[PDB]
């Protein structure tokens, strides 16, 4: 009786949200950006190849200086690369080799990683002893760690396969806030440029916008047909893009609270592993299972180019803070740095 | 055109490459085993004889180091993290023979053996394990014989038509799991009948792993 009545109210509320979104869908992003000229063909060459990982690379993250980056592989090694010279600055042996994510602190003093061990390990890069040491092991997730991102030297947000995201106080090692509401494994998260909000995509084919300080879900974005594997904020923080196993990328807007554009092609039938934006947001770069990285026109949903330089699945990619280069990591154990030429 | 400090930066980097190469060579000489099975299927009994989120077990047997991975605690979706184990030497799958007349505690309508049978072909025919050998353990062999006298195998398999004895029921169940092998050419299944007091379980894994090494060598050498 009471349960039946409540679940009917949920359907009425869902219809109210759908009607509200349809009311504000006066135009389409395609119609708005029809007049603008296309970016043309985007040709990028492999400037650097980072060799030394001996297994599949699962994550990489640029430092904020746009020169150092950290990559994670399941050979049990976290490696910090000087991308300008391809020098290895550090090689961090991981206690658990089943790493799925890695993060570079914006200050550059810390890196984080974690995987099937359900732990986010914090590593101190700047010690008087001259070695990188584990400073914290953040325990509390009951599923594998899928993504982690630093807010500062003391705060980090992690997503897990136990359907929850958590905000951690690194100094005390306790999660101050737990973000619940996903019904599937959260596979990725992205921080807003001001780090006051973050979006997460889960395997329930839904994307949720979270308030970091308040700790509740602000908005839920649906439209994908399979698990979401990747998510990335637009440079102004007012939009984000997702990548799913249904071979599509979708651009959601926070303020319009609905999807604006889909990035798919008929030839593409493989899942998407990673997504990122260029510095201006005009280019959306996505990594695919078909060993390639396709550069999309974010405004016009046209495939601007392809980064084809890997012999296995492109598992991760990232664009520098200054926008100078893009790195792609892959299951073939290599990282490549790409940019164009005049 | 390097500076005095950039030359010393490269020397540190080459020192790092020298240790990564040394670590990778040691890793390539070790055997990685993914341990699968159902709940209360004797999986933990196997680990007890071979002495967080993923439990990794190491042991050395006849100049060969085995890394056994237990992922029973991972209640998450398997298809998201099952590709991490693509490339393990072999998969050890544990099946409880006695769990044929029993039913799942949660479902209360699905047969336990059929849950294992459905789980076996989900992993055996999985795209990441197309060419991965499987070491099938049929645990609780002694307990299975006691139940087969009172409870016939017809409860689990209605189509079964044979003697109600251990020697025929156990062989019938072995053929049922091996019949689930969707690719009987690219992979092989090693079946062993284990128990709570058996001591040859580790030797069977070593014999099976030795055969997996040979088959992989023949693929590399071009003979196969």
């Amino acid at each position, epitope marked *: 009786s009471e349960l039946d009545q409540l679940r009917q109210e949920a359907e009425q509320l869902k219809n109210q949200i759908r009607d509200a979104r349809k009311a504000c869908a006066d135009a389409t992003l395609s119609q708005i950006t029809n007049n603008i000229d296309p970016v043309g063909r985007i040709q990028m060459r492999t400037r650097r190849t980072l060799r030394g990982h001996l297994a599949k690379i699962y994550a990489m993250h640029w430092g904020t200086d746009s020169r150092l980056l950290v990559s994670a592989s399941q050979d049990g090694k976290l490696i910090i690369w000087d991308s300008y010279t391809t020098n290895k*600055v*550090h090689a961090i042996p991981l206690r658990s080799s089943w790493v799925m994510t890695c993060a570079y602190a914006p200050s550059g003093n810390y890196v984080a990683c974690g995987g099937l061990d359900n732990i986010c390990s914090i590593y101190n890069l700047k010690t008087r002893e*001259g*070695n990188v040491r584990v400073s914290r092991e953040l325990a509390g997730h009951t599923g594998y760690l899928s993504c982690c991102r630093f807010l500062d030297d003391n705060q980090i947000v992690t997503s897990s396969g136990d359907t929850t995201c958590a905000l951690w106080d690194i100094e005390t090692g306790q999660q101050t806030t737990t973000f619940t509401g996903h019904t599937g494994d959260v596979m990725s998260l992205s921080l807003a440029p001001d780090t006051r909000l973050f979006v997460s995509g889960a395997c329930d084919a839904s994307a949720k916008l979270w308030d970091v300080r308040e700790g509740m879900c602000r908005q839920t974005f649906t439209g994908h047909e399979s698990d979401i594997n990747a998510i990335c904020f637009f440079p102004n923080g007012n939009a984000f893009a997702t990548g799913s196993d249904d071979a599509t990328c979708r651009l959601f807007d926070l303020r319009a609270d609905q999807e604006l554009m889909t990035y798919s092609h008929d030839n593409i039938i493989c899942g998407i592993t990673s997504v990122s934006f260029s510095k201006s947001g005009r280019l959306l770069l996505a990594g695919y299972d078909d060993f390639n990285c396709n550069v999309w026109d974010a405004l016009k949903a046209d495939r601007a180019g392809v980064l084809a330089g890997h012999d296995n699945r492109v598992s991760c990619l990232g664009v520098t803070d200054d926008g100078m280069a893009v790195a792609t990591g892959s299951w073939d154990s290599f990282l490549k740095i790409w940019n164009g030429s005049s | 055109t390097l*500076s*005095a*400090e950039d030359k010393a930066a490269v*020397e540190r980097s080459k*020192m790092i490459d020298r240790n990564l190469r040394e670590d990778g060579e040691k890793a390539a000489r070790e055997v990685k085993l993914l341990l699968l099975g159902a709940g209360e299927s004797g999986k933990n009994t196997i680990v007890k004889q071979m002495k967080t989120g993923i439990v990794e077990t190491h042991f050395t047997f006849k100049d060969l180091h085995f890394k056994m991975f237990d992922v029973g605690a991972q209640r998450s979706e398997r298809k998201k993290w099952i590709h991490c184990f693509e490339g393990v030497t072999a998969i050890i799958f544990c099946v409880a023979l006695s769990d044929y007349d029993l039913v799942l505690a949660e479902d209360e309508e699905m047969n336990r053996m059929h849950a294992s049978m459905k789980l076996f072909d989900s992993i055996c025919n999985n795209k990441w394990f197309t060419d991965t050998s499987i070491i099938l353990f049929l645990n609780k062999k002694d307990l299975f014989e006691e139940k087969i006298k009172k409870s016939p195998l017809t409860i689990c398999y209605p189509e079964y038509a044979g003697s109600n004895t251990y020697e025929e029921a156990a062989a019938y169940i072995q053929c049922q799991f091996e019949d689930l092998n969707k690719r009987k050419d690219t992979k092989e299944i090693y079946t062993h009948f284990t128990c709570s007091t058996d001591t040859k379980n580790v030797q069977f894994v070593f014999d099976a792993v030795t055969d997996v090494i040979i088959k992989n060598n023949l693929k590399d050498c071009g003979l196969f």
Partner: single-chain antibody
């Protein structure tokens, strides 16, 4: 804590031999390159030898090359300097200096206490030998180099050290602008090309000492004469 204790010094006859040892504790010794730097009595600092991490690269000063040998024992965390045919020019206090080299590292950050031995090229110039100072007043120290220390990679390889009376030198500024860890922010390094300035705002009693500028553009590493601050 990070420690570097030197031993083996003492009075030796001319033409003799002496073995210096440097025991390291509190840091990853095998990850650091190690230097010997000596200081003649009432004179400035003089670099002696260098052995890199992993022992692959070894450098010597011209005044000691062929007579001095530098080696390390990583398992024992000991750095050695075998000296032979000792001359009266070798009379100095010998300091053990650690320096690690990777992108963004701070070489020469820790120096040893030193051991005394008594026997019976870019030019760095610090013309101002002494500067009378008063507490709370801003002081600038000038250094010059015969060659431009700015490399094509953007680094300017100039280092600043402060040797308070009775103490080992301490790193203040590395690569002409970066402030070393544990050094107050009042110290600032500014320079261009061959002329460099060390600015000490709101001078305090601890800042009293001799300041040396060292170049790390190429070997041999050379020190300035040193600028003394006195009250």
């Amino acid at each position: 804590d990070v420690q570097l204790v030197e031993s083996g010094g003492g009075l030796v006859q001319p033409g003799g031999s002496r073995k210096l040892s440097c025991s390291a504790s509190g840091f990853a010794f095998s990850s650091f390159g190690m230097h010997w730097v000596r200081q003649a009595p009432e004179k400035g600092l003089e670099w002696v030898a260098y052995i890199s991490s992993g022992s692959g690269t070894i450098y010597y000063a011209d005044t000691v090359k062929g007579r001095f040998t530098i080696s390390r024992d990583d398992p024992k965390n000991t750095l050695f300097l075998q000296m032979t045919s000792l001359r009266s020019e070798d009379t100095a206090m010998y300091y053990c200096v650690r320096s690690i080299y990777y992108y963004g590292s701070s070489p020469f950050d820790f120096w040893g206490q030193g051991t005394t031995l008594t026997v019976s090229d870019i030019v760095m110039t610090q013309a101002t030998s002494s500067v009378p100072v008063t507490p709370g007043e801003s002081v600038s120290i000038s250094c010059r180099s015969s060659k431009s220390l700015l490399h094509s990679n953007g680094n300017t390889y100039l280092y600043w050290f402060l040797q308070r009376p009775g103490q080992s030198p301490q790193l203040l500024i590395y690569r002409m602008s970066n402030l070393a860890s544990g050094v107050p922010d009042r110290f600032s390094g500014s320079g261009s090309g061959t002329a460099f300035t060390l600015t000490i705002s709101r001078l305090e009693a601890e800042d009293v000492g001799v300041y040396y500028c060292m170049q790390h553009l190429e070997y041999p590493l050379t020190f300035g004469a040193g600028t003394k601050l006195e009250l």
